[PDB]
RNA sequence: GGCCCGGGGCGGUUCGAUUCCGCCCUGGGCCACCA
């Protein structure tokens, strides 16, 4: 086990099999086929025109040029109405740049519209780049698709692959452009180990400066932030992770981590030995796209998280998990319970003006002065962090994100014990209290 | 839909809020959905 032979049986787990690269030469002779006989003007993008797909995620890209002087409404209507007919089943489901999936003698094939420009200066439509990403990568990354690959499969098996609000990780662009630049999976991986928040790769002066914050500055625009939507922790997750490869070794990097399967009396104990309190907020989940949903939990459980803390519960972690059905607000914090009356600070002797003020008020218990300043005792209306949460998001759900504070809104409700454990959050739950094994 | 920056109106809470919890208008960036 040295890292040279690792990465050769490495390729085994990542290189497609030529049984899936046919499949997918098969499918990319069809989509022309197709798309000729209706005449229309397009291009193949992507990895798969590229060839740096991840061996068993085989997608065409397949962008349908437009003229710029069309509407937004054109390009979705026209697209839309090419990509059902050049498709044999298909799905339109997307965030706010139109675009049709399907699938085309079994491949998946993204058929996305966008403005064909010169320079992809003034971007016209959110997708606009890639064609010219397309330009720029092909003849760099000549040679060295197979690099390209151990990155992608060494992010994947390791939960930080997608750019998107769902995992906050590396763009498959992304990937491309920092092999181009280190030139391979093991320099990248060797110079990733010293990366800081403030690393700036800037690929096309061929140069690494420091900035305000990490930024991969895309060759095609020098204002697009390639690594916008990196998320920290997943930046320190992939660094730290360098770290421990070099430091050993192993093709468990690119192995899917444990299924994880764990049994649900095992969790009750564990959270019995933490003596913490651990419950879920539950509501039906909006039917809206992932990237909608995502940042919107993220939102609902922070402000949960910070009513939590800023009540004295002592809250540890958050997470969420969103089945086909319903989503989950998880919250795990110190304090299971808290006494009803608290100290509120009233002003100093001194000033007796507010000092009145203060005093003169309908309290139960009557202040008192320590060290120059008076002090009141005041009664809290609930005391465990459930009958808070029940009030907050009760009271609070228009501040829950568009979507999800509505859902909570017309239902959610507080599970505990035993009752919460019958749910799907085992994963989540062992996992955010850092459950080893 | 989310994040960031800025106008402008408010309710609540607090001895005391631009400054804490929130609500309406509104302007400008960026991000995810393709790459």
């Given at each position: 086990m040295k890292v040279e032979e690792i990465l050769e049986k490495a390729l085994e787990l990542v290189i497609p099999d030529e049984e899936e690269v046919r499949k997918g030469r098969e499918a990319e002779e069809e989509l022309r086929r197709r798309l000729d006989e209706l005449g229309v003007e397009y291009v193949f993008v992507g990895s798969y025109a590229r060839n740096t797909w991840l061996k068993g995620s085989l997608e065409i890209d397949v962008f349908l040029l437009f003229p710029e002087e069309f509407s937004k409404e054109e390009l979705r209507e026209r697209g839309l109405e090419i990509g059902k007919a050049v498709l044999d089943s298909y799905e339109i489901r997307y965030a706010e740049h139109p675009y049709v999936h399907g699938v085309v003698k079994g491949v998946e094939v993204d058929v996305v519209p966008c403005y064909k420009l010169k320079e992809p200066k003034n971007i016209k439509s959110a997708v606009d780049r890639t064609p010219f990403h397309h330009k720029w990568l092909e003849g760099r990354i000549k040679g060295k698709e197979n690099e390209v690959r151990l990155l992608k499969g060494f992010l994947k098996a390791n939960g930080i692959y997608g750019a998107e609000y769902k995992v906050r990780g590396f763009s498959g662009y992304l990937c491309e452009l920092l092999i181009v630049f280190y030139g391979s999976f093991l320099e990248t991986?060797?110079?990733?180990?010293?990366?800081?928040?403030?690393?700036?790769?800037?690929?096309?002066?061929?140069?690494?400066?420091?900035?305000?914050?990490?930024?991969?500055?895309?060759?095609?625009?020098?204002?697009?932030?390639?690594?916008?939507?990196?998320?920290?922790?997943?930046?320190?997750?992939?660094?730290?992770?360098?770290?421990?490869?070099?430091?050993?070794?192993?093709?468990?990097?690119?192995?899917?981590?444990?299924?994880?399967?764990?049994?649900?009396?095992?969790?009750?104990?564990?959270?019995?030995?933490?003596?913490?309190?651990?419950?879920?907020?539950?509501?039906?989940?909006?039917?809206?796209?992932?990237?909608?949903?995502?940042?919107?939990?993220?939102?609902?459980?922070?402000?949960?998280?910070?009513?939590?803390?800023?009540?004295?519960?002592?809250?540890?972690?958050?997470?969420?998990?969103?089945?086909?059905?319903?989503?989950?607000?998880?919250?795990?914090?110190?304090?299971?319970?808290?006494?009803?009356?608290?100290?509120?600070?009233?002003?100093?002797?001194?000033?007796?003006?507010?000092?009145?003020?203060?005093?003169?008020?309908?309290?139960?218990?009557?202040?008192?002065?320590?060290?120059?300043?008076?002090?009141?005792?005041?009664?809290?209306?609930?005391?465990?962090?459930?009958?808070?949460?029940?009030?907050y998001a009760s009271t609070h759900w228009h501040t829950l994100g568009k979507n999800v504070g509505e859902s909570i809104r017309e239902y959610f409700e507080i599970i505990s014990g035993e009752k919460l454990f019958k749910e799907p959050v085992t994963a989540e739950l062992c996992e955010m209290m850092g459950v080893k094994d």
């Open positions: 991986v060797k110079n990733a180990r010293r990366w800081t928040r403030r690393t700036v790769i800037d690929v096309a002066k061929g140069e690494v400066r420091k900035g305000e914050e990490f930024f991969v500055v895309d060759p095609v625009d020098e204002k697009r932030n390639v690594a916008a939507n990196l998320s920290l922790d997943n930046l320190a997750r992939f660094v730290h992770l360098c770290r421990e490869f070099m430091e050993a070794p192993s093709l468990g990097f690119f192995k899917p981590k444990h299924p994880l399967e764990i049994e649900p009396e095992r969790l009750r104990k564990i959270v019995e030995e933490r003596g913490t309190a651990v419950f879920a907020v539950k509501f039906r989940k909006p039917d809206i796209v992932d990237d909608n949903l995502y940042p919107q939990l993220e939102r609902a459980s922070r402000k949960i998280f910070e009513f939590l803390e800023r009540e004295n519960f002592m809250p540890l972690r958050s997470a969420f998990k969103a089945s086909e059905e319903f989503c989950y607000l998880l919250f795990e914090c110190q304090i299971k319970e808290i006494s009803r009356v608290f100290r509120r600070m009233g002003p100093q002797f001194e000033d007796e003006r507010n000092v009145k003020k203060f005093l003169s008020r309908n309290r139960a218990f009557r202040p008192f002065i320590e060290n120059g300043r008076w002090w009141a005792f005041e009664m809290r209306k609930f005391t465990t962090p459930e009958e808070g949460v029940r009030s």
